[PDB]
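User: Please run a holo structure prediction.
Assistant: Happy to. Please share the sequence and the ligand.
User: Here you go; the ligand is zinc ion.
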Amino acid sequence: KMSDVKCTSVVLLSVLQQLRVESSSKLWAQCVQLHNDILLAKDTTEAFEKMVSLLSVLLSMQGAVDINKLCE
Amino acid sequence: AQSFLNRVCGVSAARLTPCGTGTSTDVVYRAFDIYNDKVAGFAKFLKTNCCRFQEKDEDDNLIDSYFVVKRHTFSNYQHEETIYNLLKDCPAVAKHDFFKFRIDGDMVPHISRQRLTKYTMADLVYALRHFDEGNCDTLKEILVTYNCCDDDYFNKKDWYDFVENPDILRVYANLGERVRQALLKTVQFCDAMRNAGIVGVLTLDNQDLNGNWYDFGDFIQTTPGSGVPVVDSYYSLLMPILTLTRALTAESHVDTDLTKPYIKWDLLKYDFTEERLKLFDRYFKYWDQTYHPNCVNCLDDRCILHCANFNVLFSTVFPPTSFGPLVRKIFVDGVPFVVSTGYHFRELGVVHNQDVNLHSSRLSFKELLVYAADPAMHAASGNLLLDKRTTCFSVAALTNNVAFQTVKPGNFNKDFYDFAVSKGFFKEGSSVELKHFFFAQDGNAAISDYDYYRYNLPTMCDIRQLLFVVEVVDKYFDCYDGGCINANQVIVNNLDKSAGFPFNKWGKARLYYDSMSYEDQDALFAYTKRNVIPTITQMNLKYAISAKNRARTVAGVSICSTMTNRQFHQKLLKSIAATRGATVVIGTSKFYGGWHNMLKTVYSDVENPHLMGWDYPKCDRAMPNMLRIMASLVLARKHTTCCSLSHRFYRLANECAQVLSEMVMCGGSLYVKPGGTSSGDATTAYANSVFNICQAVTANVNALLSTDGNKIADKYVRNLQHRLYECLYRNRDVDTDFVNEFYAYLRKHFSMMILSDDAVVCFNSTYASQGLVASIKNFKSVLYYQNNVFMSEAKCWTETDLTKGPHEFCSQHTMLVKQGDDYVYLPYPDPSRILGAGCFVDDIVKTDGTLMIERFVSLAIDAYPLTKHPNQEYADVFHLYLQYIRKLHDELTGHMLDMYSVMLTNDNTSRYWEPEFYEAMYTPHT
Amino acid sequence: EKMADQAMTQMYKQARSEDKRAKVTSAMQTMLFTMLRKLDNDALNNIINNARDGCVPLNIIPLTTAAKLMVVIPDYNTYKNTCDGTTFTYASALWEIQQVVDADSKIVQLSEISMDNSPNLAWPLIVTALRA
Amino acid sequence: TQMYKQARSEDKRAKVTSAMQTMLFTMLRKLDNDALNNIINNARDGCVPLNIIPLTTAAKLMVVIPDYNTYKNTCDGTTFTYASALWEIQQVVDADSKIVQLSEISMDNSPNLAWPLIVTALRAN
RNA sequence: AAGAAGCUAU
RNA sequence: UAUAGCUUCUU
Ligand SMILES: [Mg+2]
Ligand SMILES: [Mg+2]
Ligand SMILES: [Zn+2]
Ligand SMILES: [Zn+2]
């Protein structure tokens, strides 16, 4: 259940990067720190809390239609 | 009784408190430098021949001052008084008192030395050249007693560490003035001995920490005016401590006073030769060997090392802006230029170019390449830089903006991950886990990585030991041939690599190899043998799988450097990689039985054998410049018939100016590299091996010379130690008949397998336990005092069972498996590495397994030896890869049969999902 | 003969690779949300649903117990679902409301908000709170 | 085919020669021929270290500040002295290349800027 | 043996 | 940068 979290974190950081998030230096720094922390984690609780913190970054923007992609 | 303490306390108004018991002698454990026709070494011996009393300042507080009283004989009691009467007027001679006392019925002579320090200089040198983190009480006491720190500073664990807690350098630098005053008093004592004739040998243990000399038991008279002190062992053993404690810091102040402002030099001054000569004549006056401030005047590389060692120390007191390329204005068709016509090395001096053209009519292609390759023109037209993010020297900014380069994450290969999970992989509690990923980096990563050159510090070496070590190391490279080749015989592969700055703005190595003819390349190479060509190195971040964040950078050196270094080093580098059965195993493959052959060659015929392997913390950043110079000189001994002294020196200067102190570009800005190795050079992996072998030989020399010679049962090893000490500190020339013997002794009891900064040693366990060969502790101390790093014993392994192979070598493990009928050694990787390489990729088109089926074939070739592992979870990786290859082919066939209306009649692709194509890669005879 | 077969294999490979990198964004987003759904975490699911219907955060969600979090509420139904008096429930945690301002940057008190009186302020409020 | 490949190589040799020679002549026009000449005319021989050319003749300075504490002690105010010379600020940008104002650089508003800050100044006579 | 291309590991 | 190995095509 940790490999799934790490793979999804990798994909989330890829999505954020291709959404042009590195144009902002501090936001990119925070995202990179969270992504690297998730990979090196050892317990699922801290990994999941960091994962939600990093997903909040993508949710706060408006460049990814959420309802359309949640069409199951 | 209270009469010996009253006579010892003569008319001096001193209050003494006994340290022993009455008149009974006091036994101590102190370091000595002994050579007395029966024992030789720098070791720790028991000293019980003197009674020691302590002096109290006032009230009831003890101070650091002792009254050592000795009792040897009657004949010596007159000789040491006759010598003292001649040396009594010197200010560097400890006050002596002579008196006669009766113990029971005899009049025992006594010699008293007044107001001595608890420890001597030999103790200070031994504590720092034989450092043990678990037993360092002498060093702690010396540090605390002289107000370097407080007793609580040692509660901070990792205090000794250099990489961590770099305040230990500031703590150590608190003994610099004490060491400097000791050196001054040594010079005074040498002059006093020279006057009236007191010819004798100066030893470290005969001087206390105040700088006073007190032992005259081995001196002999002579005609006043001609007396020679012997100061080889003293200075040579004290050399490494003069840079750790920064002894000569006070030489940069106005009147050599630490309370006055720093001397201010003219910004245009670069020669500094008279100052170097004055420093040498002030601190090392009786060192009996000519010193050349500029190494261009040296006689051979053995003299170049000797003089560069002194330059390393003397150059720490001069402004850092006086080092680097020396530029001047030339006129090309009348329009002024600014070019580099020299160089000022901290180690080689003030080298000057010989082919400077002040007036030119045209500008050829070779001249164009030379001029648009040095930093003079780029920096002269740049902007001033004050980068506050790093402590490294900054030269100029070549633009108006600062570049912040980042690293992106990896690419998830979801199909392979789903396939692996569907076959019971990554289950909770499994032994196979994902540990290697693609880590991302922000804009500060490049400068953060560059600022790791703060681990490079000016290191002074023990020259009398380094010379012998280099002579022994040169024997490991005898079975090779080298020399200079022509432009035709250069075999360059991958012509589409980088060309460095500024040449990467117009093309790759292909554009410059195709543009220049053979005549132009030969002319450029011959130019570098008479002139120095500074170049610029470009740093970039790399995109690869790893197990730590640890941003990684790749350096690309300019074409003008590689093109000329190839014609100098290619023959030797290609001969090193074509030899099997040697210590250096570069170029030896692990397939077709290579790993077994290498393992059985390292094992050789050692007795009571064990296996050991160590680590080099921050190898590329902390390596001292002297060791890099030594490696470069050792690799250039093949040019004994194709180059002269001047040609070889100028090639060495070019190497130093191009790959050792070059100007590095990072984010569109120019900095100054203090030292270390660069990954962009072709000779890095070959100089790393020389440095590794040099360190391994120094460890053995230190292990053998620091052993009590009276406890060595074998009569051959004892004489070997005696003659080793003699060849180091008492014989100023090369002894081949002993270099050969030491090389044979090391090869029989200390077998190594070296690949750059990676080694495996099979040694004689009994000898290592008796202190006759090196162990891990010797490596720790050697690295501490010669590399400015602490080597944790947790990063080093040991293996008593030789049938289980080395624990790790080149990131691979060893297993003794059964192939056919015999038993062989096979290397296998970390399963997590293979799984991560399969699951995460660095390109979106590599995530479609159908278009890339050879990636998995190559990955399964490396994962085969896992099928013979006892663990069944490790052995499933090979089968998973085979199944994935089969499924990929099955899917690709259908995809091609639908996208088109054709199918391959014959494929011959079934060999890749069967366990024979991969099993044949580890069987010999191919 | 083989010349033609190997030519077709090269042509197919070029067609696929040129199409693999021509659909990176949509494929990556689809994969990310498929994996997020498969993870099935309450903390992630709550925020995903809230962002889907009404609630989107204005800054990275803090993990400490003191850092401030600001959220966006589109209407009153989301306020009922997520806001119950003086307590805020978001991302599987308890948040205490500290200050609410309507869409025109005019401060608003909690007691004012109700159902009938909802159509009297700039609805897209901005609620701030701190972790328990 | 040998002749065609040689012609391509012979063409690229002149193509890169112009680039190398054009770069060198462009840098000639950025050299302060009357300020860089003063220091060279003072050297006892004519040779000077390359490290003191930008230090004593450059007309523009660029400072990279990691945080506000370093800004306070290095480039505070409008004019600051570095390398025994007086420099006057001209512009300030952050890690995103946006223009920053000296008023926004405070100890309370500090945690709102992309902090790697590049301060460019002009030598004042 | 010469090459031209692709890939994997150290 | 250097080393080693695998697959394809031409001479
Ligand atoms: Mg003695
Ligand atoms: Mg290893
Ligand atoms: Zn010399
Ligand atoms: Zn040569």
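The two ends of chain D are 64 Å apart (CA to CA).
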